[PDB]
Amino acid sequence: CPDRWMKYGNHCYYFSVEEKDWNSSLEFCLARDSHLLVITDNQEMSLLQVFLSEAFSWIGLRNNSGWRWEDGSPLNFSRISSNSFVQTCGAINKNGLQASSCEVPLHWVCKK
Amino acid sequence: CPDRWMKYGNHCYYFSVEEKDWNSSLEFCLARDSHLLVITDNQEMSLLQVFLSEAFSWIGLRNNSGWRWEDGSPLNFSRISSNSFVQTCGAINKNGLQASSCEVPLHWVCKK
Amino acid sequence: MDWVIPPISLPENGPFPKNLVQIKSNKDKEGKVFYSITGQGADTPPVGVFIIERETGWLKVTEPLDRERIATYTLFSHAVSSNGNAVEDPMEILITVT
Amino acid sequence: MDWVIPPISLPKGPFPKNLVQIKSNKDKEGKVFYSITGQGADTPPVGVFIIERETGWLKVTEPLDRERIATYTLFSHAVSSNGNAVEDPMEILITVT
Structure with missing residues (x-):
């Protein structure tokens, strides 16, 4: 994996050390031949969570006619909580998935 | 303890067979020389839940500028959940305390 | 304000539809x-998780909830007469998944 | 609709404690x-949550183990100098976990 990226299995992950809104995070990953985090299952989620704090990180999940990942796939595991209906982008911290307004600057995770 | 009441320690509990609204439940217990359940502590709440199902039972708890028992004492243990702001009477099931509209007929518990 | 909302706690299982409580x-x-x-779980994604019998007020869950992924559902109940005129303001109903 | 609400996660020591900055x-x-406004805000239990008027910093003021509410339903309001609302109130649900 490239420098500053973490290897887990057959993939490389980038945990940011600064904050960007959802759109800018998505763009940052794309510029690096990667994608804003699309979690495949509970094992991967649990592993990646060990590297997170209580602070939230953007992932490639949004409420677009239901919670679905950026690769078109609908959310089929775990659970996401929300404080307000305007929170349409998804994020993750060490405790789970939560919704946030997309304009909020948060850390983010890329996966290659 | 009177017939059909359950004895535990030096106390007698009545677990209703049918349903009544909150005021009617209160009146009933008073007519039987007792009181619609005022749970004293987390110990007694735990004791009680062993005998409850998923169905809710009325207890002597109401939201009057905050949740408090009919003896005037504020609720000082556990937690109560609610679906709607108009649910101002308290009930309990095997999983916990929940608010309900007072007009709803529910099973109830008396203690003497 | 004449809404009567019973305590709602999700079950643990079917068959579906499964009755929750009767609102009135x-x-x-x-x-x-x-x-x-109306609201998430009703007319907004996830759609149709919950439905209410128009004449009886019986609120029902239509599928095992392991099929859905949200923590709480904020629904709004409505009450109208034959002509469609509202006889109450909508009541917000929060359902938390345990 | 121009409310921006960050993801809230409840945390004892430095109170009041910042949760998120809304705007x-x-x-x-x-x-x-x-x-x-709301139960936990301006109605019992009063002052569990407060918000910095000019900045939007929403804060919690005490360990929540002292409270009995499972989920708080708060509403945020935004007005101009003249006191007129520039947004409809936004409901903010906070579950104690």
Whole structure:
């Protein structure tokens, strides 16, 4: 994996050390031949969570006619909580998935 | 303890067979020389839940500028959940305390 | 305000639809009342998780909830008469998944 | 609709404790002032949550183990200098976990 990226299995992950809104995070990953985090299952989620704090990180999940990942796939595991209906982008911290307004600057995770 | 009441320690509990609204439940217990359940502590709440199902039972708890028992004492243990702001009477099931509209007929518990 | 909302706690299982609680407006004492619900879980994604019997007010869950992925559902119940005129303001109903 | 609500996660020591900073993007048109209402805000239990009026910093004031509410339903408001609302109230649900 490239420098500053973490290897887990057959993939490389980038945990940011600064904050960007959802759109800018998505763009940052794309510029690096990667994608804003699309979690495949509970094992991967649990592993990646060990590297997170209580602070939230953007992932490639949004409420677009239901919670679905950026690769078109609908959310089929775990659970996401929300404080307000305007929170349409998804994020993750060490405790789970939560919704946030997309304009909020948060850390983010890329996966290659 | 009177017939059909359950004895535990030096106390007698009545677990209703049918349903009544909150005021009617209160009146009933008073007519039987007792009181619609005022749970004293987390110990007694735990004791009680062993005998409850998923169905809710009325207890002597109401939201009057905050949740408090009919003896005037504020609720000082556990937690109560609610679906709607108009649910101002308290009930309990095997999983916990929940608010309900007072007009709803529910099973109830008396203690003497 | 004449809404009567029983305590709602999700079960643990079927068959579906499964009855949760019967909601009602005491305005039904003056005339026939018709019920409906809106909000996530009702008319917004996830759609149709919950439905309400228009004439009885029986709120029902339509599928095992392991099929859905949200923590809480904020529904709104509505009550109107034959002509469609509201006999209550909508009531917010929060359902938390345990 | 211009409310921006970050993800809230409840945390004892430095109270009051900041949770998140909320804002309305209407602030790019004028000075906005924030307030919150609701059980846990302006009604019993009073002051569990407070918000910094000019900045939008929403804070919790005590360990929540001292409270009995499972989920708080708060509403945020945004008004202008003249006291007129520049947004409809936003409901903010906070579950104690």
